[PDB]
């Protein structure tokens, strides 16, 4: 379960292939990679 | 640094996520944390969809 804000950002780092998990990344960068990743997943989904 | 400028841009990212994620109501304000929660569930769904169900080999 996602109980706090940091748990949410950390989860997103795991889920999004393009977000590095072994160097520092900003919250802002996380949001942008998440956005791009969603756009990619949606076009793939739409193909079906 | 321009603290508020970066915050407005983060805020823009949050608003975009509101558009992208179906489960999120757009004609209503939603907290940043709830937005990330909807985002996480939605990405998980899309992954399961694309990784398993949408495969020809899916049983
Ligand atoms: K990752
Ligand atoms: K929406």
Author numbering:
A (entry chain B): 35 to 82
B (entry chain A): 30 to 88
Manuscript text:
We have solved the structure of the ID2 homodimer HLH domain (residues 24–82) at a 2.1Å resolution, coupled to a stabilizing 14 amino acid linker region (LKPSFLVQSGDIAS). The asymmetrical ID2 structure contains one homodimer consisting of α & β monomeric chains different predominantly in the loop regions. The final model of the ID2 homodimer contains a 54 residue α-chain and a 47 residue β-chain representing the HLH domain. The topology of ID2 is, as expected, similar to other bHLH proteins such as E47, MyoD and NeuroD, with the same parallel, four-helix bundles. The main difference is the absence of the extended helical basic region in ID2 compared to bHLHs, hence ID2 is highly unlikely to bind to DNA. The dimeric interface is held together by a hydrophobic core consisting of residues M39, L46, L49, M62, I69, I72, L75; all of which have equivalent reported buried residues in the structures of E47, MyoD, E47-NeuroD and ID3. Besides the hydrophobic core, there are also three inter-chain hydrogen bonds at Y43α-Y43β, L49α-Q76β and Q76α-Y71β. However, our structure reveals C42 on each monomer pointing away from each other; their distant proximity does not allow the formation of a disulfide bond. One of the most striking observations in our ID2 structure is the presence of a positively charged ion near the N terminus of the loop, the first observation of its kind. The size and the interactions of the ion with the side chain oxygen molecules of K47, V50, I53 and Q55 (with distances less than 3.5Å) suggest that this ion most likely corresponds to that of potassium (K+).
